[PDB]
Structure 1
Amino acid sequence: QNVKGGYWFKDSGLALNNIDSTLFTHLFCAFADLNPQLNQLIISPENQDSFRQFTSTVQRKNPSVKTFLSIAGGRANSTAYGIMARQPNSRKSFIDSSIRLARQLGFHGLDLDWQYPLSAADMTNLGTLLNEWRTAINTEARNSGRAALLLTAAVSNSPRVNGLNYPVESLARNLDWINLMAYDFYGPNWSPSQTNSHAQLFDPVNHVSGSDGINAWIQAGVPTKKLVLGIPFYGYAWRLVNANIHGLRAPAAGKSNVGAVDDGSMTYNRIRDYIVESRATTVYNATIVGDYCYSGSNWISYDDTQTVRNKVNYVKGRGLLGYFAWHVAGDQNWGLSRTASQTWGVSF
């Protein structure tokens, strides 16, 4: 089966019951947390009510949709995961609790979003963790007579992150697939001084792109059929230094106040509304395969219809397993989700 994936989190402002699960094959419920005292996977009090109903609810609209419980994510404490992965006993309690929790709540899979291991030792220990996790998943399948839980991971665009190499052999051998985070290449909180496409499929300038990421993962020895390309339903707004200079790599002064206070981020839906209200000029850049818009001193990078269509055709043509969206609530009336699904077409 090909993957048409979508991530959801409670604080996204889309009600669980309003996720259009007909546009996806796999939905990822984000995020379960690590209890550092127990070294067990848990669900926070705030997430409890929705996470327990996640699978049954989304399956009402589409009984064939499969669900993942996603783990950790961008706001998690990476040191807690490093500690957990350090020892056989803490790995075992994490592994066992994750499998129990997935089964208890009806999830068909577990998705590790550790962002990111902090040292080479942590990367090595991640490799060991996945070895043991796979064995335990296979054993539970055998013992219960049930189909094995799926195991995936959301990973950096390239297999080298923060100067550290992923345990690529372990990822390739143990995971059903990897979710490539082909976005956040640039953003006001890490690259404030110039505009850039945060998810560009191509990059002739610096080779920071989704295609270059795919290529790096392939060169590292992960098979093409285990790659799923991430697509963002959001973007970032920069403040331009000079409103007249508004292409890629235009001088900037950090986040624009049209975006979120903390990081300048905006959902695709919010960007679409902004384009209408400000009469912003929009650009599809065919070289990079990405969109941006500008109005006055405000400049926003995002993926619109043509970019989503072209990305999906590109990865389909290349023999990747599929795509996923971060995150479903960011879409405008399921526009990009439908574009992606229908562009892919038949999902097997």
Structure 2
Amino acid sequence: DGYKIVCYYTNWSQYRTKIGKFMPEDIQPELCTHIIFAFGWLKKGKLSSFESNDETKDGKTGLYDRINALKKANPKLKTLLAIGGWSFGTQKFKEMSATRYARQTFIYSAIPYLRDRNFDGLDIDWLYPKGGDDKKNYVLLLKELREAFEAEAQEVKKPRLLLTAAVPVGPDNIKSGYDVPAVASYLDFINLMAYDFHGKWERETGHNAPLYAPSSDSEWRKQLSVDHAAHLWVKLGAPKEKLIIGMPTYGRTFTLSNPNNFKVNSPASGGGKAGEYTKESGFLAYYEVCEILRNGGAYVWDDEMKVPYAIHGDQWVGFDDEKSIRNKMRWIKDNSFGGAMVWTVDMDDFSGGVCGGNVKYPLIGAMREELRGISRGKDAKDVDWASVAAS
């Protein structure tokens, strides 16, 4: 194939208002190599629909089909259905993976659920397995998924269902839940969630996803970087080419205790203000940060972490822009990784009119440029935030 651009689509972006309202049709069919639908759900231990909107029933197409319709314009595109995520909790996953009967019950529900809806594979987003029991059962679930997927592919003579998983970057989390060598052997590839290294759960300011940890940081702290985390999965037994490194189209926000101290690892009095469209304190969509910059926000590039943050009053945002991204893509190329994962496709300037470069998908578009050599076309150019906004 080459390098992968795996984009996560979220079915709750449909509920956003004005510039943030996102429908599947807002995805260019050749933007990504894989689209992962977030999320499916679990019910009675079986793969089920999150809510009716995703399913098509009344002769009105649901979100599943509206997504998978993208494969008509681009046959080479692959779609997966992801189950889990944060809001899903762990308890249901523990119970599903507990016994072989519990697992197989899930597995044999999943395969027809996926085929009947024209999905090409399955993404397991259990956050996270924890303890020695989960560590074993997590592996068992992946193994038995792989086995069955394989068997089915041969019986029905179709290309095999893909099996993937989103996995964490917190060293603690990893050690405690993931038999990495085996976990990787059964997955087709690995979505490394190289983000949420820092957030409103901390009394300090920190970047959502630095490539390298600052000098300001503590040595134990220094472990928190996209570079350390990724190399840590290779060290534990993961194949380089199965690692798809996560890239955030969102930023984690803070409120400065004192707006005069706006440097990274400054004291913060809690999370930053909610975005107007995302409506959740502690983060903003990249297009929501563009608005801040284009309305008096100051921009700062941290040449240590190779990522930027922005400030407006006592509001502090760590994010990724085209400069931050590209540098990362080169990093991927350099370390020979599988490609890029993107959380999310719906929080990039998908419309083209917000950040101001008049280019749809400036970020993921730049990932596809660097990794797969496909121009954003025309004369589109990175917005040069430095000059554009105050310091």
Equivalent-residue separation in structure 2 for 1:163 and 1:229 (angstroms): 19
Measured against aligned partners, the alpha-carbon deviations of 1:257-292 in whole angstroms (never above 9, x if no partner) come to 254664421100111012112x11111212112110
* Map 1:59-98 → 2, pairs under 5 A: 59-98=71-110
- Cα distance, 1:167–1:51 mapped onto 2, change above 3 Å: farther
- Cα distance, 1:138–1:258 mapped onto 2, change above 3 Å: closer
Q: CA deviation at 1:163?
A: 6.0
5+ residue gaps, structure 2, are 14-20, 57-61, 353-360, 375-391
AA aligned opposite 1:197: H
Q: Which residue of 2 aligns with 1:337?
A: 364
Equivalent-residue separation in structure 1 for 2:171 and 2:339 (angstroms): 19
Paired residue total: 342
- The yes-or-no answer on 1:305 pairing with 2:322 is yes
Q: Which residue of 2 aligns with 1:27?
A: 35
Equivalent-residue separation in structure 1 for 2:33 and 2:197 (angstroms): 27
Contact 1:158/1:214 (CA < 8 Å) preserved in 2?
A: no
Measured against aligned partners, the alpha-carbon deviations of 1:81-115 in whole angstroms (never above 9, x if no partner) come to 10110001110011111111111111111110111
Equivalent-residue separation in structure 1 for 2:124 and 2:63 (angstroms): 16
Counterpart selection for 1:16 from 13, 21, 24? 24
AA aligned opposite 1:47: D
Q: CA deviation at 1:17?
A: 1.2
Equivalent-residue separation in structure 1 for 2:178 and 2:300 (angstroms): 35
TM-score normalised over the length of structure 1: 0.94
Measured against aligned partners, the alpha-carbon deviations of 1:49-81 in whole angstroms (never above 9, x if no partner) come to 434314432224423211011111111031111
- The yes-or-no answer on 1:105 pairing with 2:103 is no
- Cα distance, 1:157–1:54 mapped onto 2, change above 3 Å: farther
* Map 1:1-348 → 2, pairs under 5 A: 1=1, 2-12=3-13, 13-35=21-43, 37=44, 39-44=45-50, 45-49=52-56, 50-158=62-170, 160-161=172-173, 164-188=176-200, 190-191=201-202, 193-204=203-214, 205=217, 206-259=222-275, 262-277=280-295, 279-332=296-349, 333=352, 334-346=361-373
AA aligned opposite 1:295: H
Q: CA deviation at 1:14?
A: 1.0
Equivalent-residue separation in structure 2 for 1:60 and 1:309 (angstroms): 30
Equivalent-residue separation in structure 1 for 2:76 and 2:285 (angstroms): 28
Q: CA deviation at 1:169?
A: 2.3
5+ residue gaps, structure 1, are none
Task: Give me the CA root mean square deviation.
Answer: 1.7
Equivalent-residue separation in structure 1 for 2:333 and 2:174 (angstroms): 29
Q: Which residue of 1 aligns with 2:379?
A: none
Measured against aligned partners, the alpha-carbon deviations of 1:181-234 in whole angstroms (never above 9, x if no partner) come to 00001111x21x111111111115322011101111011011111100000000
AA aligned opposite 2:212: F
